[PDB]
Every structure is written in structure tokens, then in C-alpha cells.
Write a protein that binds this ligand. Structure first.
Ligand SMILES: *[C@@H]1O[C@H](CO)[C@@H](O[C@@H]2O[C@H](CO)[C@@H](O)[C@H](O)[C@H]2NC(C)=O)[C@H](O)[C@H]1NC(C)=O
Ligand SMILES: *[C@@H]1O[C@H](CO)[C@@H](O)[C@H](O)[C@H]1NC(C)=O
Ligand SMILES: *[C@@H]1O[C@H](CO)[C@@H](O)[C@H](O)[C@H]1NC(C)=O
Length: 178
RNA sequence: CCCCCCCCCCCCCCCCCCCCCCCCCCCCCCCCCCCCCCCCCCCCCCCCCCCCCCCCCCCCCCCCCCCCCCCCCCCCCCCC
């Protein structure tokens, strides 16, 4: 009957989240999982495949430095919020969030975001996305179709980045209308 | 039919340097909040001790009065 589980700063050595870490939570109807401040460094594929009813996943304030292949979110069929702010570095790809179309909140502040300007936008499948946070990442380049199709977006945080060149009339190809 | 040598222009890539722009970290100063300790001022409280004042109680002392008992002395009258 477990619906809420907080594991914030509960461990000394939890560096890698393999596909066997949460197998003991398979039969729990877990909705909220908090994993902040655990010095987590790597998330493997199918790490959260055992949490099918999960709605909130908080992974901020860790040392996660990797490239999000998108397989880390397999099995998250009811997820609504993913918190990833204040990690080492996150590199996005075409299918980083292709397995979680039900996502509504995505926080990516202070993660030193890389490759957010992919030709197919990493945020394209997120049709229900409402809140997106990309602040304090020193992002310099954004394509005009980064947020295409996100008709439900309501909050967009882009402060403390470097987007000045994109809005200059002398920028090659003209200003970026994102 | 075939090589080599010059000229301009257009490039590509790797380094160096200089620019704005931004991020992170740190330093200096200031401000705010919280915590701890300490000082100063004023109004008080309780307890103890000392002193003073009022009132009261008990005991005692001094003086006086009353009653009882005891003793001495004065008048007067009878009995044998
Ligand atoms: C996960 O747990 C952490 C730590 O308990 C929560 O972080 C706190 O969040 C509140 C509200 O945002 C802040 O006021 C506190 O300062 C935070 N504490 C720390 C140490 O950062 C976090 O909110 C939890 N996440 C979820 C989704 O519940
Ligand atoms: C976890 O991944 C390993 C490596 O791919 C695999 O051998 C193993 O069967 C997986 N565990 C489960 C429970 O699927
Ligand atoms: C997005 O939200 C709408 C409205 O609640 C819903 O119909 C749709 O199923 C959602 N999409 C996903 C993938 O959950």
C-alpha cells in the first residue's frame, strides 16, 4: 500500500541506479519517490521499470553526469513530474523523453544542458508538458522548433543562459523565433 | 597529345591572440534573518536577616484597695 517514499540523503554509497535497484518496489503502488542528495552519478536503462504507477520522481541535487539515451524512463507509464535540477551534466538526444509522453513538469536547472538544439527537438514527444525549467545552464544555441507542438506549455524558465546572439538581426539566418 | 613554374580569387582544417556575452567558483564590502553569550537601564516578585512602629498576650515588679484568718491593746458588765 506504499504510496509515498522519501529517500532524500538516505545513503552513503548509491552511485549507480541499475535495473535491479527498485525491484523490491515492484508490487507497491508507489506514486512519489524522492531521491535527492544521494550523490547518484549514473542511471542505467530500466532503472525505474518497476515503478509503473509513479507520478513524481525527484532526482535533483545529485552528481548525475551522463547522456540521457531515453531508456532510463522505460516503464514510467503514469509519470507527471521529473526533477533533475542541480546535477553534474545532462546531455540530451532525439529520444531522451520519447518514452514518457504523459510528462507535465520537467525541471532541468543547473545541469549544464548539452545538445538541447537537436534537429528533432528532445521535448517534441512531450505533448502534455506544462512546466519547463532550463535556467542557469549557459545555453547558447536553440533551434526555432525546440518547443513546437507544445500547446499546453504554461511556464517557461530560461533565465541565466546566453541567448543574446539568437535575437540579433545580424545573426546568420535571422533571429530565432522559439 | 603531355609536365612544371608564377598571379589573383574562393575555400577547408588545425593553433595563437583579441573582443563582446554567459555560466560556475571564489574574494571584498554591506544588509537581513536566526542562534549563542554578555553588558546597561527601569519596573517588580519571593525568601532570609537586621532595625523601627502599632496592637495584643503571658509573666513579673512597684504602689494601693477589699475580704478572710490570726495576734495585741483600751472601755464596760456579771458569776463564784
Ligand atoms: C524531496 O526532498 C527534498 C528534501 O527533503 C525536498 O527539498 C525541500 O523542498 C522544499 C520545498 O521546495 C524546500 O523548502 C526545502 O528547502 C528543500 N530542502 C532541501 C534540503 O533542499 C524536495 O521538495 C522533495 N521533492 C519532492 C518532489 O517532494
Ligand atoms: C538487468 O540488466 C541485465 C543486463 O542487461 C540483465 O542481464 C538482467 O536480466 C536485467 N534484470 C532484469 C530483472 O531484467
Ligand atoms: C495528455 O492529457 C490529455 C488530457 O488530460 C489526455 O487525453 C492524454 O491522454 C494525455 N496524454 C498522455 C500521453 O497521457
Amino acid at each position: 500500500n506504499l504510496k509515498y517514499l522519501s529517500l532524500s540523503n538516505s545513503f552513503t554509497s548509491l552511485r549507480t541506479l541499475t535495473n535491479e535497484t527498485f525491484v523490491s518496489l515492484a508490487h507497491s503502488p508507489l506514486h512519489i519517490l524522492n531521491l535527492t542528495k544521494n550523490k547518484i552519478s549514473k542511471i542505467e536503462s530500466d532503472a525505474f521499470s518497476w515503478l509503473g504507477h509513479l507520478e513524481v520522481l525527484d532526482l535533483g541535487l545529485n552528481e548525475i553526469g551522463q547522456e540521457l539515451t531515453g531508456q532510463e524512463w522505460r516503464g514510467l507509464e503514469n509519470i507527471f513530474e521529473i526533477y533533475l535540477s542541480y546535477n553534474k551534466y545532462l546531455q540530451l538526444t532525439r529520444n531522451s523523453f520519447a518514452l514518457v509522453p504523459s510528462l507535465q513538469r520537467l525541471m532541468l536547472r543547473r545541469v549544464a544542458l548539452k545538445n538541447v538544439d537537436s534537429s528533432p527537438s528532445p521535448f517534441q514527444p512531450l505533448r502534455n508538458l506544462t512546466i519547463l525549467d532550463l535556467s542557469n545552464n549557459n545555453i547558447a544555441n536553440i533551434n526555432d522548433d525546440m518547443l513546437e507542438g507544445l500547446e499546453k506549455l504554461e511556464i517557461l524558465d530560461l533565465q541565466h543562459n546566453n541567448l543574446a546572439r539568437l535575437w540579433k538581426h545580424a545573426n546568420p539566418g535571422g533571429p530565432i523565433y522559439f
